[PDB]
Design a protein around this ligand. Structure first.
Ligand SMILES: Cc1[nH]c(/C=C2\C(=O)Nc3ccc(S(=O)(=O)N(C)c4cccc(Cl)c4)cc32)c(C)c1C(=O)N1CCN(C)CC1
Ligand SMILES: Cc1[nH]c(/C=C2\C(=O)Nc3ccc(S(=O)(=O)N(C)c4cccc(Cl)c4)cc32)c(C)c1C(=O)N1CCN(C)CC1
Ligand SMILES: [Ca+2]
Ligand SMILES: [Ca+2]
Ligand SMILES: [Ca+2]
Ligand SMILES: [Ca+2]
Ligand SMILES: [Ca+2]
Ligand SMILES: [Ca+2]
Ligand SMILES: [Ca+2]
Ligand SMILES: [Ca+2]
Ligand SMILES: [Ca+2]
Ligand SMILES: [Ca+2]
Ligand SMILES: [Ca+2]
Ligand SMILES: [Ca+2]
Ligand SMILES: [Ca+2]
Ligand SMILES: [Ca+2]
Lengths: 285, 285
């Protein structure tokens, strides 16, 4: 999936920057032949993390997951072109609009996220980094799950303890959490938190520093919506079963697709409206 | 610690085989200058596992841990010479004598193992593969903890997920078990099982296949001695607190060194006697 024979800078042009951070710059790229836009990383022996990421991406051909457009290794730089999502990240949308999503909007995101997760889990791919910032929007009002970096760094490890009789109980449990049917449950919890983040702009425990947050997650009862009366019983029930601290009894995405919070969602209209409103808001000067 | 400049086959001669298995052959080597004997691996990009192992070994200079005599990379082969232990592994001793250890013998092994683990844990090294087969004997009746392969493969990983607010409780717990003060607790549990193995020849759940054993460890109450009346209250109490399923409340090696099962053990005589008896038994033809 990494093309060696083709030179990438004859097919793509880097026309802008989308972001920057701890994992380098993300560029906006334009196809000089077709005019298609991509999010791009041009990366100059931790390229094996990116190699595993490309392989996941290439395997993850699905309507609600970001589509890999091309990967190259040329002169050396590793190029990785992925489909541009002009609607942006849902957390940027909430910041731009200065508000959380409506329940109808959350229902669409939830339905589509569940379809994506059901697909990934079928392929034994665990995302492990769900959050509103990794839910990207199209102008049509569909999501795309993004950022398989954590997924890939985790998979590289597993692809790469003790002798069982002598193994401590906590070691048995954490090695048993590395495999089916427990590994994928993590994404279901993170989905629930993401839905709260979308309802309330911030996730639970946002006021605490990251290290205190970890203690809080382990020891606290599962998070609930701050103002329950704003939300349907269906939404609160959905969260109640998704935010199960016990991964054994936490439902799969397939099971959650039959929950009445999402089982009747057959239109993306609420999300298409959201993206239109965000676009119009961005235009204000 | 890996010598490049010196050619190893001018210092050592491979004079025998000690073992074979899934991790290759272990040779017996003799120093052509001094006459000292070593256990040797001569290994022809998973050499980084062995590199981390050498670094651990070089750091683990202690009376009750195997002593690294030399590591080389020459013509390409990786040579790793470690001190020969003529008494052999405690599990081989039990098989040779067709019996378990006496309580006085177990007390000495336990005292010395605790001293070793207290040292390792001070260096933030977790063995992760304690068992009677990794407790080696000298003719003097001292142990040497051996086989840091699992330790090294684990450390290579840590030296080499998610964002905390969205992280599932079970993921928080298993990442929190990867660090102090929880990581080292695993060795305390494995010590307890090892002591049962030494008392009874076989560890608990030896009748079950390895995959069933894992379920059994997670769900069962902690193991106890099969015939309690053979053993002191002190031994049974020691096991009771060491085989704590909760790593939070499981004692450290330092705490266990003050337990009356080991706190008064100031002589290795019982173990020196054991090794003499095993030697004499081996001589029978
Ligand atoms: C408009 C917009 N696009 C993006 C990011 C995109 C995108 O449009 N397409 C896309 C695909 C994948 C990814 S990724 O997270 O998986 N990722 C980092 C990545 C990308 C390429 C290669 C590899 Cl290996 C990995 C990230 C993205 C963002 C964050 C925004 C946005 O909110 N904003 C941007 C515009 N601002 C003015 C407002 C906020
Ligand atoms: C007599 C004897 N010696 C050994 C093994 C030794 C030894 O004598 N010294 C020693 C040091 C280290 C290790 S190790 O487990 O850490 N290991 C595998 C290793 C070694 C070298 C390099 C590296 Cl990286 C790793 C293993 C050993 C064994 C298993 C026996 C034994 O019971 N027996 C052998 C004789 N039989 C007739 C009876 C049973
Ligand atoms: Ca697509
Ligand atoms: Ca605004
Ligand atoms: Ca992002
Ligand atoms: Ca914030
Ligand atoms: Ca509803
Ligand atoms: Ca406006
Ligand atoms: Ca406005
Ligand atoms: Ca020594
Ligand atoms: Ca015999
Ligand atoms: Ca061995
Ligand atoms: Ca056995
Ligand atoms: Ca006693
Ligand atoms: Ca005899
Ligand atoms: Ca005999």
């Amino acid at each position: 999936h990494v093309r060696r024979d083709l030179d990438p800078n004859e097919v793509w042009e880097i026309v802008g920057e989308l972001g920057d951070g701890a994992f380098g710059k993300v560029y906006k790229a334009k196809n000089k032949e077709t005019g298609a836009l991509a999010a791009a990383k041009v990366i100059e022996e931790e390229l094996e993390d990116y190699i595993v990421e490309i392989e996941i991406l290439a395997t993850c051909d699905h309507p609600y997951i970001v589509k890999l457009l091309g990967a190259y290794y040329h002169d050396g730089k590793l190029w990785i072109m992925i489909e541009f999502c002009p609607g942006g990240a849902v957390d940027a949308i909430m910041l731009e609009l200065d508000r959380g999503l409506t329940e109808p909007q959350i229902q669409v995101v939830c339905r589509q996220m569940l379809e994506a997760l059901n697909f990934l889990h079928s392929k034994r791919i665990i995302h492990r980094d769900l959050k509103a910032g990794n839910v990207l929007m199209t102008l049509e009002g569909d999501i795309r799950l993004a950022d398989f970096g954590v997924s890939a760094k985790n998979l590289k490890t597993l692809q790469k303890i003790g002798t069982p009789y002598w193994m401590a109980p906590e070691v048995v449990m954490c090695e048993t959490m590395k495999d089916t049917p427990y590994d994928y449950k993590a994404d279901i919890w993170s989905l629930g938190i993401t839905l709260i983040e979308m309802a309330q702009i911030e996730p639970p425990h946002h006021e605490l520093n990251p290290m205190r947050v970890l203690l809080k997650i382990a020891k606290s009862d599962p998070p609930t919506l701050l103002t329950p009366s704003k939300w349907s019983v269906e939404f609160r029930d959905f969260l109640k079963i998704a935010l199960d601290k016990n991964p054994e009894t936490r439902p799969s995405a397939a099971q959650l697709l039959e929950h009445p919070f999402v089982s009747s969602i057959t239109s993306n209209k609420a999300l298409r409206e959201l993206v239109a409103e965000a676009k119009a808001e961005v235009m204000e000067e």
